[PDB]
Amino acid sequence: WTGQESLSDSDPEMWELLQREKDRQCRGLELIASENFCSRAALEALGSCLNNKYSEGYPGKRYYGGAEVVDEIELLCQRRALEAFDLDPQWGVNVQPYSGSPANLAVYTALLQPHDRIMGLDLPDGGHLTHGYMSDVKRISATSIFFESMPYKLNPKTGLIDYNQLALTARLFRPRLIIAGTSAYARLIDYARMREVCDEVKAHLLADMAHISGLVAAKVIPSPFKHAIVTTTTHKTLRGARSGLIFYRKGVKREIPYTFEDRINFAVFPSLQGGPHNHAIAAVAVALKQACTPMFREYSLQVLKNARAMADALLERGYSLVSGGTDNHLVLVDLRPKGLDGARERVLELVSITANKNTCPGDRITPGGLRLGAPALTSRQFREDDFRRVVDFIDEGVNIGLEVKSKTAKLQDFKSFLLKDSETSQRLANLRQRVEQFARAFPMPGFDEH
Amino acid sequence: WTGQESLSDSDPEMWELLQREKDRQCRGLELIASENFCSRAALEALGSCLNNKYSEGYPGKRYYGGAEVVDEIELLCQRRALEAFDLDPAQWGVNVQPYSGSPANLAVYTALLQPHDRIMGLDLPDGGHLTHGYMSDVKRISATSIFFESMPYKLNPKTGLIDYNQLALTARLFRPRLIIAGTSAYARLIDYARMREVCDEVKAHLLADMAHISGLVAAKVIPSPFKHADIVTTTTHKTLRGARSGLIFYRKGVKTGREIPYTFEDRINFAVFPSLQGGPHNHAIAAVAVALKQACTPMFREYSLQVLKNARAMADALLERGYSLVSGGTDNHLVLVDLRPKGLDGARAERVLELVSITANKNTCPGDITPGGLRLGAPALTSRQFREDDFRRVVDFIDEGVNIGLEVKSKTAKLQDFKSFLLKDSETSQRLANLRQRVEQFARAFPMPGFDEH
Amino acid sequence: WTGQESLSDSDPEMWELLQREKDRQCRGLELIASENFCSRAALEALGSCLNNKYSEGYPGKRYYGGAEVVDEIELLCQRRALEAFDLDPQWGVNVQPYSGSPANLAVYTALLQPHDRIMGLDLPDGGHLTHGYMSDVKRISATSIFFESMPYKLNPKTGLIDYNQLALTARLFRPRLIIAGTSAYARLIDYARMREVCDEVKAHLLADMAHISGLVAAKVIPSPFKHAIVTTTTHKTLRGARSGLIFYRKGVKREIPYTFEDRINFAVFPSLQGGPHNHAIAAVAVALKQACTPMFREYSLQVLKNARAMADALLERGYSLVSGGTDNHLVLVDLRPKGLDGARERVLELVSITANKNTCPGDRITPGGLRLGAPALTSRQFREDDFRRVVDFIDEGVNIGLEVKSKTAKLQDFKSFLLKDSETSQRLANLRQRVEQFARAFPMPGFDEH
Amino acid sequence: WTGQESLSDSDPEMWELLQREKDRQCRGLELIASENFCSRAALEALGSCLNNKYSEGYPGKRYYGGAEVVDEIELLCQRRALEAFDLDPAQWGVNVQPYSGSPANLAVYTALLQPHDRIMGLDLPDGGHLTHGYMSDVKRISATSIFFESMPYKLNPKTGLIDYNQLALTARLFRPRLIIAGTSAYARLIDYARMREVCDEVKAHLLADMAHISGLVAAKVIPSPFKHADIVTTTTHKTLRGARSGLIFYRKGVKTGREIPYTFEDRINFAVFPSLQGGPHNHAIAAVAVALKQACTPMFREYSLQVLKNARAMADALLERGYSLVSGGTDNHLVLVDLRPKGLDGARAERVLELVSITANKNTCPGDITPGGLRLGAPALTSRQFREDDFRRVVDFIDEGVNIGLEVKSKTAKLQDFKSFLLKDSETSQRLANLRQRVEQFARAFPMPGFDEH
Ligand SMILES: Nc1nc(=O)c2c(ccn2CCCCc2ccc(C(=O)N[C@H](CCC(=O)N[C@@H](CCC(=O)N[C@H](CCC(=O)O)C(=O)O)C(=O)O)C(=O)O)c(F)c2)[nH]1
Ligand SMILES: Nc1nc(=O)c2c(ccn2CCCCc2ccc(C(=O)N[C@H](CCC(=O)N[C@@H](CCC(=O)N[C@H](CCC(=O)O)C(=O)O)C(=O)O)C(=O)O)c(F)c2)[nH]1
């Protein structure tokens, strides 16, 4: 045993399940909002020898040693972050977060004291749990256990941010930080609006560029670097490895400076994390060079044009859509007026198009909508003529659930309907086969084999 | 643009630094204790297409969909983790989603302890990690010390072993809710049954950190903490020779007439998700499961027994050169040389051997901001098929390297001037070039796990 | 030296200032809302030998010994509390709080965990600080430091409790306890209203009977013992010594019981306090027997009739009045439409009628109204014909401040106006003399001498 | 109804119990340490018309109005407090609004410490109060332990003195923000300069509790803590022979070129109001100021020297009867008899002497839920013009009373049965009646401060 044997011959049991997943990602049209298909160039760096380097430290201030190469890869991800997200090196960025969720908790540990107060878009309102979600029976997110805070909702019959129930709940809550983060929100954030709301309440505003990372970088969608520190994930829209970073402003705000400088750096290490995943830091810096290319500018223009083409086709098929339309990479289809809901995701799962339940902007265990994300298959060189091609397959998939829902009542029986009916089982097996035949016809980033 | 281009031509600027570090890992003698060289089989799965699967959920309990195949790597990683440390699945459970060892430690705190509850951990300048609860005398630095109150338990400064007396004493005076038997820089073994008797007298949860001894415990090479602890956290890398991730081992099953249950299973699983993390790094989950099956093989046992034999040969050789080792010696994978009797501190050595391409780290010796010792790690080069005869050759290179720094200390005074002395002195740099190149010729001659090119 | 010498001969320096205060309390018409004049029978028990008894314990569960007499005085205050505030001994009461503020913090330590959440009427909205008041620069009340919580406001152009901004801010805050407490609020609390709001939000509702203690006891004003635990002070309206108590429901709410039982008893001791002020517990129990008398029923009917007579006379004099009128013991005069404000209290201070600034229901350092309390001089056998007699003296006092305000700008100069003008100094010296001559003509509870 | 009726005719039901307790205070030998008999001059001011003055504010900084005269009692109470303990007003300040000693202690915590900061205090079963931070091994009971984290510092169990070694040790391991030199049941004196060296090595605020030694310090009878402490809290009653209130003493004035200031003045004043309290109990503020001027007189010095002489005569007499005293003896106002060598616990004695009209309290002796000793207090009867010859007569009555309980223990077993034995046994009750009545004849013969009638 040497340690350089092939995965196919060292452990064929895992090689089995590795390329069975590569099959399913090519066999199916992944329309999950948070999902993307990383490039081979970044996937090669993700599984590189940089995993064998413990670099607990910082540029010039490392507690270890021998981090010669890792230092310049360290700063290059920073330089590429300042170049993919313009502005004078006036701005600083930290690239050590293990993912997007640790990036949000890090900024809280950096700027907020324990049990300090936050404002955040509720998870059933277009956010993730990192934004501060307590349930009415239990505290769910650690951002809600270590920091007390209250949800920030949007207009339930308009789909845009409710700035009336915002300044109201703000003056009555006086938090130290609010979040303008998006997980399921189809339009644009008014940055200048909430910035002065944050000084009326004396709060810092933080967003999540998780679903718009590449949209802001290619100047296709507006950026916060004149109206906001704000954190983001590496993947989803930037088409990279699983990591995260935190964008903080540096310099003056003698004049008063900006305090968002070394406390964020101190929060990710040595406060919350330890060894930087240097293989991920380099993998994403390859995708950070991807973000400075003209192809990425055209790819990003493709994802919005495709998200609007997906919407306009979804619009004509008889679907109501919260928000009114779309101005991002995502769709928030409202299926309740069409007799469908979010949970009855299982039907399209056995057809091999992966979606997710989404909180209905205004309903009452069963959600009422679902969330589709364009950039996943748009990375497969999809087009708008192929983006109304998707819609007929979603329209066909809805009709299978719409008919079995009329033949049942329970949903423990609705999902068992697709298993024992042996007639809908004929209809699903045939439906996925053409979805598999269609999905396999487009290129797929990454390795041909794994 | 297709997305399947080679890294060498898509970004030659990173291909530049990718094999320049692969050179430096072959170019240098990595003596860091926490560092290892992962296997090629795991690196292929680590940078696989499993990064393109968002599986926010749990095996069979996922809020998303299409998780048919991606689930099976999780449950197989579960079974392989319970098999690498010989735990029958009806008595023990394991969670394989922690992104690393630090999120794994904080997850157990959020799972069993309430905010501002009390923790006890070996102090960092005494052999512990930051996740164990380390405050400075001016500031709380680690998040385990901000969200949870904590107090250190130090060692006997003239014994080098964990003072298990000043632990049970101050525990009765502190009433903590969880104690850690976790080690980052300590050359001997933790008396787990001892810490078991302290943890049930005060009613506290006992957690260990197999971070530096995971594979030593996996090969049954050293006594295990899975019989004297309720929780056990570990890293997937370090001694286990895997990807950078973490695990959490919790006991399941049975613990008036009615029986006491076990509460850790569903509280730990809730802490890692949806409380603290989000998308599970499945590319790492599969990579560490690949190193988990290798870890159940007789080859991994032989490797782990070699790590001990090499760590003791490195220690016994350093002893004869006139060096001091706290605790007296070693029974694990690491050495903790005390450089104070040799007229040199921890930091100034760490710079000398760094520019010679022997990677060490400063370590604080019981006594005194600038340390006086270093931490040497066997499992890094033991994975390079090193032997004891090749591990006393390393020691002579360290002994020769110390004398280079020991002489510049006589020619300088400060340490802002000590580090620029080793750069411009065309005579000590000439002596450095011979030692650095000769270590390179020695280090480059050994095999290296992973891709030769990547 | 024996220890039984008279205060007049042992320390004449303090006897001087003791009977100079008894002069000023008789020489002036105390119209402070929180103020009352205690009876001699209770004042005698307040300075009794019960100060020399350390009774750290509880009925039958005392850690000390020899508390034979103090036990029956202990329970008698309880029995008199259950008799002055009817209902089956279904209800329990704790009589150890040192005052009213420690009573509120005790119920929080009893039912709430540290940093749990509260809802409370803001201090500038009719509450005290015990209700949870944070300033926009500093946390002021300890109820706001040990428990995070947010204010509960009222309708700013109606004066009644804003139940729209109540259920709104409630669902978005999900606290464990809300307060319905009054310090400056002229009307009645809808108890049944907020009780079900407290179960929609899953919160306990606590009030402060501080300004209505005797009004609820004589059945003149509605009680909470069917729609609420709720704490109160001993004095203000009950005309007793300075202490406090906490009223908690006992028994069932097998059936689920009420948890408000031994945790309140544990919070006042041994958690927050120590030695019970037994001299105060007995002094107030004398005033608790006062609350079961027909005279107290007629006295309480006098305070409301006088508060409405004071209002109706204040109404006709050209004063606007928030809330619309009055249904309690208090007045919340709105002086801004009359060119006066709250701060310009100094004028009537040198005239010897003591008032206090009150937060204007809707203004912008200088408040805009003041708070008068009827039960203070109503204890001096005042009448309604004597309660419009007050109004002309308040009307005259306003006109002194209204004219000097036109002759100055600053208020550091407005208060120095009444010192150096030597013409308004003639007008104030003459004004207080007839106020002193009028106030001295009525009986005064307590000792003739001290 | 006028409001000026006599208590005897307005409520004869309370006049019933008012002089029935005044009887019982003359009827019995009050041996409680914390208890004293307040002066008539203070009782007149305590139940004065100053209860009818709401003065939410501070001398010169009141948010209300008409506080002309009521202010002057405050500032005079300030001056008299600084004069009773010899503190020049430019170096020390005092706050006179705390309702008692417990709100005074928590006020200093809210003033200088943040929530969940750390406190150190002598454990309650070791000689401390609850305000010092006492948690049980199952529950946090005192509010000082819920809002602030804390840990006890115990005593040497075979010395009876405060272990100042296991204090500076565990302090370096605990990094507290404030330590207390406060005592509730400890017969010797606290080494303040010792606790001063521990409190500045860890940078912590040193606070004392003169609760049991306020008047002993006021008469300069025992060494004072006003030279080795930044804060000092005290009760107005107990040894100071005043009304039930509290005080807080903080240092003011001066503590690179620039000088260090003192931060306690405006932080302490803000904690007592408007943070924690509301209306100042001015009737108590004036009452304690009356006892504060008496405390600066040679009569109060003679009384305080007598409290020591009587406490030592009580101790030396108990020693000869075959009783044990922890610490060895006494140098303050209290005795801590250890009843375990006499075959009897703390609780069962406390019942016997209670029904004989000698008031004691159970006290836990270093060793073991049901104590084994009691706490005897001199200043209660020393205020009744007691002498040492009259304080060994008390001891013989305690010695005789113990033998009554020592024999019933041989005739019963439980303590639910021990307390009903002393009630229905027409033979031990006959022996109790002689001892109780003869203590009554002795106790009734001494003067009593306060009203004879009230
Ligand atoms: N066994 C063990 N366990 C582990 O876990 C471990 C290993 C190996 C790796 N690992 C895991 C990774 C270990 C990570 C780690 C460790 C310790 C500290 C720490 O705490 N050091 C302080 C000094 C740190 C300190 O003063 N920080 C100041 C900065 C002040 C400054 O920069 N300059 C001032 C200027 C003042 C003037 O103007 O005069 C000066 O001159 O001092 C602050 O934060 O404020 C100390 O050594 O005590 C740490 F942070 C981060 N082995
Ligand atoms: N030097 C000193 N300092 C002072 O400050 C001081 C003095 C003199 C006066 N002062 C100031 C006043 C002192 C105030 C003070 C003191 C101690 C405790 C305390 O903490 N005691 C616990 C037992 C207390 C305890 O178990 N409480 C249970 C109740 C459980 C129960 O009632 N029954 C169960 C049934 C179980 C079954 O069904 O089996 C049983 O049987 O045990 C709880 O709270 O849950 C102990 O002694 O350790 C205290 F609370 C309150 N002298």
Side-chain angles (χ1 to χ4, degrees), chain A residues 56 63-64, chain B residues 124 128-130 134 141 184-185 369 375:
Chain A
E56 272 162 337
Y63 302 86
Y64 269 154
Chain B
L124 182 136
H129 199 249
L130 305 142
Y134 169 76
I141 81 151
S184 272
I369 185 69
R375 181 176 48 118

PDB file of all heavy atoms in Angstrom, chain A residues 56 63-64, chain B residues 124 128-130 134 141 184-185 369 375, ligand 1:
ATOM      1  N   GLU A  56      -3.258  27.286   9.926  1.00  0.00           N
ATOM      2  CA  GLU A  56      -3.913  28.099  10.941  1.00  0.00           C
ATOM      3  C   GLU A  56      -3.187  29.426  11.117  1.00  0.00           C
ATOM      4  O   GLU A  56      -2.176  29.497  11.825  1.00  0.00           O
ATOM      5  CB  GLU A  56      -3.982  27.350  12.272  1.00  0.00           C
ATOM      6  CG  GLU A  56      -5.211  26.474  12.423  1.00  0.00           C
ATOM      7  CD  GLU A  56      -5.051  25.432  13.508  1.00  0.00           C
ATOM      8  OE1 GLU A  56      -3.895  25.089  13.833  1.00  0.00           O
ATOM      9  OE2 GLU A  56      -6.078  24.946  14.028  1.00  0.00           O
ATOM     10  N   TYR A  63       0.423  31.146  12.811  1.00  0.00           N
ATOM     11  CA  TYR A  63       0.977  30.496  13.992  1.00  0.00           C
ATOM     12  C   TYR A  63       1.802  29.263  13.654  1.00  0.00           C
ATOM     13  O   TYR A  63       2.434  28.696  14.553  1.00  0.00           O
ATOM     14  CB  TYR A  63      -0.144  30.092  14.954  1.00  0.00           C
ATOM     15  CG  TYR A  63      -1.015  31.234  15.431  1.00  0.00           C
ATOM     16  CD1 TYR A  63      -2.106  31.660  14.684  1.00  0.00           C
ATOM     17  CD2 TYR A  63      -0.753  31.877  16.634  1.00  0.00           C
ATOM     18  CE1 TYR A  63      -2.906  32.700  15.117  1.00  0.00           C
ATOM     19  CE2 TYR A  63      -1.548  32.917  17.075  1.00  0.00           C
ATOM     20  CZ  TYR A  63      -2.622  33.324  16.314  1.00  0.00           C
ATOM     21  OH  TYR A  63      -3.416  34.360  16.750  1.00  0.00           O
ATOM     22  N   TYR A  64       1.816  28.843  12.397  1.00  0.00           N
ATOM     23  CA  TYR A  64       2.473  27.610  11.976  1.00  0.00           C
ATOM     24  C   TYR A  64       3.755  27.971  11.218  1.00  0.00           C
ATOM     25  O   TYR A  64       4.537  28.778  11.731  1.00  0.00           O
ATOM     26  CB  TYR A  64       1.492  26.767  11.174  1.00  0.00           C
ATOM     27  CG  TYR A  64       0.684  25.791  11.988  1.00  0.00           C
ATOM     28  CD1 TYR A  64      -0.560  25.363  11.549  1.00  0.00           C
ATOM     29  CD2 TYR A  64       1.165  25.289  13.190  1.00  0.00           C
ATOM     30  CE1 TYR A  64      -1.306  24.467  12.282  1.00  0.00           C
ATOM     31  CE2 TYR A  64       0.424  24.391  13.934  1.00  0.00           C
ATOM     32  CZ  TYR A  64      -0.811  23.984  13.475  1.00  0.00           C
ATOM     33  OH  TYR A  64      -1.556  23.089  14.207  1.00  0.00           O
TER      34      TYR A  64
ATOM     35  N   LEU B 124      -5.027  25.830  26.453  1.00  0.00           N
ATOM     36  CA  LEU B 124      -4.229  25.830  25.229  1.00  0.00           C
ATOM     37  C   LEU B 124      -2.731  25.925  25.489  1.00  0.00           C
ATOM     38  O   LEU B 124      -1.975  25.135  24.896  1.00  0.00           O
ATOM     39  CB  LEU B 124      -4.704  26.951  24.299  1.00  0.00           C
ATOM     40  CG  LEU B 124      -3.966  27.021  22.960  1.00  0.00           C
ATOM     41  CD1 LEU B 124      -4.946  27.242  21.829  1.00  0.00           C
ATOM     42  CD2 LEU B 124      -2.906  28.114  22.972  1.00  0.00           C
ATOM     43  N   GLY B 128      -4.069  21.911  25.020  1.00  0.00           N
ATOM     44  CA  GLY B 128      -5.425  21.826  24.527  1.00  0.00           C
ATOM     45  C   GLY B 128      -5.646  22.657  23.271  1.00  0.00           C
ATOM     46  O   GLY B 128      -4.807  23.451  22.851  1.00  0.00           O
ATOM     47  N   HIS B 129      -6.820  22.459  22.677  1.00  0.00           N
ATOM     48  CA  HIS B 129      -7.247  23.203  21.504  1.00  0.00           C
ATOM     49  C   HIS B 129      -8.104  24.395  21.919  1.00  0.00           C
ATOM     50  O   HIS B 129      -8.413  24.598  23.096  1.00  0.00           O
ATOM     51  CB  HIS B 129      -8.014  22.276  20.557  1.00  0.00           C
ATOM     52  CG  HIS B 129      -8.107  22.780  19.149  1.00  0.00           C
ATOM     53  ND1 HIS B 129      -9.292  23.212  18.594  1.00  0.00           N
ATOM     54  CD2 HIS B 129      -7.169  22.910  18.183  1.00  0.00           C
ATOM     55  CE1 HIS B 129      -9.079  23.592  17.348  1.00  0.00           C
ATOM     56  NE2 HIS B 129      -7.799  23.419  17.073  1.00  0.00           N
ATOM     57  N   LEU B 130      -8.496  25.200  20.929  1.00  0.00           N
ATOM     58  CA  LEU B 130      -9.335  26.357  21.209  1.00  0.00           C
ATOM     59  C   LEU B 130     -10.784  25.958  21.441  1.00  0.00           C
ATOM     60  O   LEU B 130     -11.479  26.591  22.243  1.00  0.00           O
ATOM     61  CB  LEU B 130      -9.257  27.355  20.054  1.00  0.00           C
ATOM     62  CG  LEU B 130      -7.868  27.836  19.645  1.00  0.00           C
ATOM     63  CD1 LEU B 130      -7.787  27.971  18.136  1.00  0.00           C
ATOM     64  CD2 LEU B 130      -7.553  29.155  20.317  1.00  0.00           C
ATOM     65  N   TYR B 134     -10.810  28.295  25.598  1.00  0.00           N
ATOM     66  CA  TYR B 134      -9.603  29.030  25.952  1.00  0.00           C
ATOM     67  C   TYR B 134      -9.909  30.520  25.964  1.00  0.00           C
ATOM     68  O   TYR B 134     -10.270  31.093  24.930  1.00  0.00           O
ATOM     69  CB  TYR B 134      -8.459  28.735  24.979  1.00  0.00           C
ATOM     70  CG  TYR B 134      -7.283  29.672  25.151  1.00  0.00           C
ATOM     71  CD1 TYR B 134      -6.403  29.523  26.214  1.00  0.00           C
ATOM     72  CD2 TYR B 134      -7.061  30.712  24.259  1.00  0.00           C
ATOM     73  CE1 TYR B 134      -5.331  30.381  26.380  1.00  0.00           C
ATOM     74  CE2 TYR B 134      -5.992  31.575  24.417  1.00  0.00           C
ATOM     75  CZ  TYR B 134      -5.129  31.404  25.478  1.00  0.00           C
ATOM     76  OH  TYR B 134      -4.064  32.260  25.638  1.00  0.00           O
ATOM     77  N   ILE B 141     -11.272  34.558  23.359  1.00  0.00           N
ATOM     78  CA  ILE B 141     -10.841  34.481  21.967  1.00  0.00           C
ATOM     79  C   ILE B 141     -11.606  33.408  21.195  1.00  0.00           C
ATOM     80  O   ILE B 141     -12.083  33.658  20.088  1.00  0.00           O
ATOM     81  CB  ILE B 141      -9.306  34.305  21.874  1.00  0.00           C
ATOM     82  CG1 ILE B 141      -8.851  32.863  22.090  1.00  0.00           C
ATOM     83  CG2 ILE B 141      -8.609  35.220  22.871  1.00  0.00           C
ATOM     84  CD1 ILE B 141      -7.568  32.541  21.359  1.00  0.00           C
ATOM     85  N   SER B 184      -4.302  18.556  22.131  1.00  0.00           N
ATOM     86  CA  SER B 184      -3.620  19.072  20.950  1.00  0.00           C
ATOM     87  C   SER B 184      -2.100  19.005  21.026  1.00  0.00           C
ATOM     88  O   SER B 184      -1.456  18.907  19.980  1.00  0.00           O
ATOM     89  CB  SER B 184      -4.041  20.528  20.686  1.00  0.00           C
ATOM     90  OG  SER B 184      -5.201  20.598  19.885  1.00  0.00           O
ATOM     91  N   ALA B 185      -1.504  19.060  22.229  1.00  0.00           N
ATOM     92  CA  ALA B 185      -0.038  19.029  22.363  1.00  0.00           C
ATOM     93  C   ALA B 185       0.309  18.413  23.724  1.00  0.00           C
ATOM     94  O   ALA B 185       0.602  19.105  24.702  1.00  0.00           O
ATOM     95  CB  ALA B 185       0.577  20.420  22.204  1.00  0.00           C
ATOM     96  N   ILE B 369       5.081  34.427  26.421  1.00  0.00           N
ATOM     97  CA  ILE B 369       4.390  34.874  25.217  1.00  0.00           C
ATOM     98  C   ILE B 369       5.106  34.322  23.986  1.00  0.00           C
ATOM     99  O   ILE B 369       4.487  34.051  22.958  1.00  0.00           O
ATOM    100  CB  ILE B 369       4.282  36.412  25.182  1.00  0.00           C
ATOM    101  CG1 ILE B 369       3.440  36.866  23.988  1.00  0.00           C
ATOM    102  CG2 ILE B 369       5.663  37.060  25.175  1.00  0.00           C
ATOM    103  CD1 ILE B 369       1.982  36.503  24.111  1.00  0.00           C
ATOM    104  N   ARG B 375       6.675  21.165  18.633  1.00  0.00           N
ATOM    105  CA  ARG B 375       5.828  19.981  18.564  1.00  0.00           C
ATOM    106  C   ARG B 375       6.172  19.242  17.280  1.00  0.00           C
ATOM    107  O   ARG B 375       5.975  19.773  16.182  1.00  0.00           O
ATOM    108  CB  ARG B 375       4.348  20.369  18.602  1.00  0.00           C
ATOM    109  CG  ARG B 375       3.375  19.202  18.557  1.00  0.00           C
ATOM    110  CD  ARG B 375       1.939  19.688  18.693  1.00  0.00           C
ATOM    111  NE  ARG B 375       1.652  20.814  17.806  1.00  0.00           N
ATOM    112  CZ  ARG B 375       0.744  20.791  16.837  1.00  0.00           C
ATOM    113  NH1 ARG B 375       0.025  19.697  16.625  1.00  0.00           N
ATOM    114  NH2 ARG B 375       0.551  21.861  16.078  1.00  0.00           N
TER     115      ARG B 375
HETATM  116  N1  LIG E   1      -1.605  22.817  22.383  1.00  0.00           N
HETATM  117  C1  LIG E   1      -2.103  23.380  21.140  1.00  0.00           C
HETATM  118  N2  LIG E   1      -3.468  23.863  21.070  1.00  0.00           N
HETATM  119  C2  LIG E   1      -3.965  24.420  19.847  1.00  0.00           C
HETATM  120  O1  LIG E   1      -5.080  24.810  19.799  1.00  0.00           O
HETATM  121  C3  LIG E   1      -3.052  24.506  18.618  1.00  0.00           C
HETATM  122  C4  LIG E   1      -1.747  24.042  18.693  1.00  0.00           C
HETATM  123  C5  LIG E   1      -1.163  24.250  17.432  1.00  0.00           C
HETATM  124  C6  LIG E   1      -2.159  24.833  16.656  1.00  0.00           C
HETATM  125  N3  LIG E   1      -3.260  24.971  17.383  1.00  0.00           N
HETATM  126  C7  LIG E   1      -4.508  25.548  16.901  1.00  0.00           C
HETATM  127  C8  LIG E   1      -4.287  27.014  16.487  1.00  0.00           C
HETATM  128  C9  LIG E   1      -3.832  27.928  17.642  1.00  0.00           C
HETATM  129  C10 LIG E   1      -4.498  29.318  17.531  1.00  0.00           C
HETATM  130  C11 LIG E   1      -4.182  30.294  18.687  1.00  0.00           C
HETATM  131  C12 LIG E   1      -3.459  29.889  19.802  1.00  0.00           C
HETATM  132  C13 LIG E   1      -3.193  30.798  20.823  1.00  0.00           C
HETATM  133  C14 LIG E   1      -3.659  32.108  20.733  1.00  0.00           C
HETATM  134  C15 LIG E   1      -3.374  33.137  21.864  1.00  0.00           C
HETATM  135  O2  LIG E   1      -4.259  33.511  22.562  1.00  0.00           O
HETATM  136  N4  LIG E   1      -2.008  33.658  22.066  1.00  0.00           N
HETATM  137  C16 LIG E   1      -1.762  34.645  23.142  1.00  0.00           C
HETATM  138  C17 LIG E   1      -1.182  35.940  22.510  1.00  0.00           C
HETATM  139  C18 LIG E   1      -2.148  36.553  21.459  1.00  0.00           C
HETATM  140  C19 LIG E   1      -2.379  38.064  21.679  1.00  0.00           C
HETATM  141  O3  LIG E   1      -1.726  38.660  22.472  1.00  0.00           O
HETATM  142  N5  LIG E   1      -3.423  38.764  20.895  1.00  0.00           N
HETATM  143  C20 LIG E   1      -3.661  40.212  21.093  1.00  0.00           C
HETATM  144  C21 LIG E   1      -2.960  41.013  19.964  1.00  0.00           C
HETATM  145  C22 LIG E   1      -2.032  42.130  20.500  1.00  0.00           C
HETATM  146  C23 LIG E   1      -0.892  42.460  19.498  1.00  0.00           C
HETATM  147  O4  LIG E   1      -0.944  42.036  18.390  1.00  0.00           O
HETATM  148  N6  LIG E   1       0.252  43.290  19.906  1.00  0.00           N
HETATM  149  C24 LIG E   1       0.348  43.830  21.271  1.00  0.00           C
HETATM  150  C25 LIG E   1       0.451  45.357  21.215  1.00  0.00           C
HETATM  151  C26 LIG E   1       0.254  46.008  22.594  1.00  0.00           C
HETATM  152  C27 LIG E   1       1.064  47.297  22.756  1.00  0.00           C
HETATM  153  O5  LIG E   1       0.883  48.263  21.966  1.00  0.00           O
HETATM  154  O6  LIG E   1       1.914  47.392  23.682  1.00  0.00           O
HETATM  155  C28 LIG E   1       1.553  43.210  21.974  1.00  0.00           C
HETATM  156  O7  LIG E   1       2.705  43.675  21.772  1.00  0.00           O
HETATM  157  O8  LIG E   1       1.396  42.235  22.757  1.00  0.00           O
HETATM  158  C29 LIG E   1      -5.167  40.461  21.133  1.00  0.00           C
HETATM  159  O9  LIG E   1      -5.958  39.592  20.683  1.00  0.00           O
HETATM  160  O10 LIG E   1      -5.616  41.529  21.618  1.00  0.00           O
HETATM  161  C30 LIG E   1      -0.827  34.051  24.190  1.00  0.00           C
HETATM  162  O11 LIG E   1       0.184  33.387  23.830  1.00  0.00           O
HETATM  163  O12 LIG E   1      -1.063  34.226  25.414  1.00  0.00           O
HETATM  164  C31 LIG E   1      -4.382  32.508  19.623  1.00  0.00           C
HETATM  165  F1  LIG E   1      -4.838  33.796  19.533  1.00  0.00           F
HETATM  166  C32 LIG E   1      -4.645  31.603  18.600  1.00  0.00           C
HETATM  167  N7  LIG E   1      -1.231  23.463  19.964  1.00  0.00           N
END
